[PDB]
Design a protein around this ligand. Structure first.
Ligand code: HEM
Ligand code: HEM
Ligand SMILES: NCc1cccc(OCc2ccc3ccc(N)nc3c2)c1
Ligand SMILES: NCc1cccc(OCc2ccc3ccc(N)nc3c2)c1
Ligand SMILES: C[C@H](O)[C@H](O)[C@H]1CNc2nc(N)[nH]c(=O)c2N1
Ligand SMILES: C[C@H](O)[C@H](O)[C@H]1CNc2nc(N)[nH]c(=O)c2N1
Ligand SMILES: [Zn+2]
Lengths: 407, 411
């Protein structure tokens, strides 16, 4: 019931007790582990509220205080009466930071307590959402000195008045299915680039077009908005060695801003809660550039390096992969845009993990996601045993809106 | 109950039914996943259903389920269990068992090869000297002048747990490691503790950087004895790089044959505590883990210096760069000397084909993503994007505690 995790490079053993406060489920049973699966009423509500208020009031050294009991009473009264309840700003901020702190797949959690929370619960229209999102983008970007932030739109009431950002990220590059058969731009965004083109967007059918925003307020049909280019910080990709690298025609945006997740605090559901940090270099260079079902230019880069691409055993893909990631990092660092290499971030995470074991009794972590997509075993997280479990408040996945939307 | 796995790169969806035949526990619960944890005397009472389960599988595989051969074998085993409190496998059952143990090894990426295993029955062995002979023959057969062949040698099963056969070496061939007074290590830091035992047992250490460790062999529960593998049986490969000529002067080499020797083979409730098996290396085992793990030979630094890399910021990825060239050199050296090896691109691609075949022909393929994905360049291999299900099937290879921690000393 008290679990120990071992690091095999250092022999350090940590003891986990925090898992015992887990409430949601893993998908795993005693007979089968699903660790590598990517996507595993008034009476429901009060225990959920109680649990949260209990941990909130504990965090401020006022468990079993009049205020705590008062608040529990007030919330209880609101629930029976109104069929939902409203979070105080302090609770909203606490809940958002803890949803990040609890994100078992996030390697960047050492930064969890420094999150700027934007209360957008007074928003009523897509134009309102656009304004809030522009402000978020401007604030988070900070001329390249990136700052973590989240903007929270009104909570679900009854499933018919959902606020939803249809984009998966605030800033992404378009992708179009051509008649030649291949693909122009970002292959991940093909179906989405289509729906924009459908919904009225004029695609400049190019390769690196910043997608428009598709915003759904109060359950209504979604609306297109172009983000002001001066708010979209982009980074030209060059190599500190291959002068031919710039000729490839590659750039990327500085702000990773995930916008399709659901934020759960005290039983309440926030279906629209875009949040942003800054990139780990491998997200762009390994996944975004060199994945097959993405920009997939490993082949092209190796060509210009004149590597032997006849046999896989020359490791030309590995050689190219590294140089590319050197460039991404180089380009961002030159342009003074915040970025972290996977060696620094994983080192940071080990320290965060030990801090959390020390001050909280645990840190839920998903090894499958925490270990970087290149050079895994030369990073410290590879030899670190992790325990994965679901704590609340939390970020959850939700279905794409188009599959769901009652038009 | 059916379970689906999806490949996020191809959108191929497979359906698993095999997991229903799973018995052993994972460690996980609906409250927690222990998927990243490395390592989370048997009464006749529980032995018979284990034997029956195995015999049912066996006679199904040969299309004789419910046959008189099946039923008589069942009765024969039953009687032997209530009489002698254990039983003996036929050679045929033993070979099936060992092959299926490998087929069931969820952490093994090389399983496309599972049906080609040479099984050596060493169950008539009684002494450490006999163990040395069987192991020598295994090494010679498996090495095959560089044309490696998968093999397993199986020593007598456990009885009361007081007469165990054990190979104390973690692998049949490994380099010594010596802790120096100044805190630095000579040779392989992974083998320091074992090297000490050997030395204590009477081994005269050459105290070099690449000394092949002696075999420490325990028969029938007696104290282990030291043997030297004839050096002509240990095929080794000098490591050089195809473009960097200074690489040879690092003085590196590695042995050709990976032969894991500390695992326990379980078949039908029987436990074979000494069952050394061998295949061939995936390049990253040597070049990423053996050479570049900070807790092993750890030569990234010296390789990086000689490459004249920007070693100041990690963000130069000097570690990643050196890691690649080292792995190129390992593959190059082995191919050039015509010693069997496989790169991680080839091996993972083959595993995907194997896994798809297993889903079709068998209903599933237990796989441990944490172990299947290679320790470098993970996402540019096809296994990275593959959902996998992990569960435990028998026959199986299990971990067991190091023998020096459990052995009752005779004198
Ligand atoms: C500030 C620097 C940050 C860094 C370096 C970072 C890094 C990462 C990385 C590399 C991943 C894996 C994502 C992938 O491979 O697709 C990830 C996942 C994730 N991050 Fe962080 N992140 C940061 C900030 C944040 C913030 C501010 C939040 C929330 C407020 C957050 C919440 C999450 C969540 C929920 C996931 C998992 C998403 C999923 O389950 O699919 N991260 N992060
Ligand atoms: C023939 C070529 C083979 C290749 C290329 C191969 C590859 C691998 C690799 C790379 C690992 C991960 C090891 C690590 O990183 O520590 C592994 C694990 C494993 N292999 Fe295979 N293998 C082969 C043959 C075999 C054979 C012949 C057997 C048994 C008869 C076997 C049984 C296992 C088992 C039980 C594990 C799990 C080890 C553990 O749980 O610690 N493999 N294999
Ligand atoms: N890959 C599937 C999928 C679906 C939905 C969200 C998601 O999250 C990826 C993600 C989430 C948050 C991040 C925060 C910062 C960052 N640099 N990357 C981040 C990447 C991933
Ligand atoms: N690292 C923990 C540990 C402890 C004991 C054995 C072991 O085996 C790893 C292993 C097992 C079988 C293998 C078969 C072939 C091969 N090339 N490598 C292989 C590597 C691993
Ligand atoms: C903590 C983690 O379980 C441990 O370091 C594992 C990770 N994956 C691995 N994968 C392979 N193939 N071999 C290993 O030794 C390990 N070590
Ligand atoms: C099949 C597998 O679960 C899938 O490819 C996962 C693996 N690990 C990952 N790890 C991170 N950080 N991000 C990812 O998108 C994925 N994808
Ligand atoms: Zn699990």
């Amino acid at each position: 019931r008290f679990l120990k995790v071992k690091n095999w490079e250092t022999d350090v053993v940590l003891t986990d007790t925090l898992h015992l406060k887990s409430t949601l489920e893993t998908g795993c049973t005693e007979h089968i582990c699903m660790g590598s699966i990517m996507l595993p009423t008034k009476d429901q509500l009060f225990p959920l509220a109680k649990e949260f208020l209990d941990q909130y009031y504990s965090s401020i050294k006022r468990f079993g205080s009049k205020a705590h009991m008062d608040r529990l009473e007030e919330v209880n009264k609101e629930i029976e009466s109104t069929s939902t309840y409203q979070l105080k700003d302090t609770e909203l901020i606490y809940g958002a930071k803890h949803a990040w702190r609890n994100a078992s797949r996030c390697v960047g959690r050492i930064q969890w307590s420094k999150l700027q929370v934007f209360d957008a619960r007074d928003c009523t229209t897509a134009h309102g959402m656009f304004n809030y999102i522009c402000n978020h983008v401007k604030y988070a970007t900070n001329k390249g000195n990136l700052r973590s932030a989240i903007t929270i739109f009104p909570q679900r009431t009854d499933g018919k008045h959902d606020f939803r950002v249809w984009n998966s990220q605030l800033i992404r590059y378009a992708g179009y299915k051509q008649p030649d058969g291949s693909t122009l731009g970002d292959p991940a965004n093909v179906q989405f680039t289509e729906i924009c083109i459908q919904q009225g967007w004029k695609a400049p059918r190019g390769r690196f077009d910043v997608l428009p925003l598709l915003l759904q307020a109060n359950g209504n049909d979604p609306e297109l908005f172009q983000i002001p280019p001066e708010l979209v910080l982009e980074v030209p990709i060059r190599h500190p060695k291959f002068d031919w690298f710039k000729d490839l025609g590659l750039k990327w945006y500085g702000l990773p801003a995930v916008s399709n997740m659901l934020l759960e605090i005290g039983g309440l559901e926030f279906s629209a809660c875009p949040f942003s940090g800054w990139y780990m270099g491998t997200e762009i260079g390994v996944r975004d550039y060199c994945d097959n079902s993405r920009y997939n230019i490993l082949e092209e880069v190796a060509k210009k390096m004149d590597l032997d691409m006849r046999k896989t055993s020359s490791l030309w893909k590995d050689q190219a992969l590294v140089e590319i990631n050197i460039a991404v990092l180089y380009s961002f660092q030159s342009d003074k845009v915040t970025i972290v290499d996977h060696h620094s971030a994983t080192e940071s995470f080990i320290k965060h993990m030990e801090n959390e074991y020390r001050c909280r009794g645990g840190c839920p972590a998903d090894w499958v996601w925490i270990v970087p997509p290149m050079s895994g075993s030369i990073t410290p997280v590879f030899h670190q045993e992790m325990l994965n479990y679901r704590l609340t408040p939390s970020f959850e996945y939700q279905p794409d809106p188009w599959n769901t939307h009652v038009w």
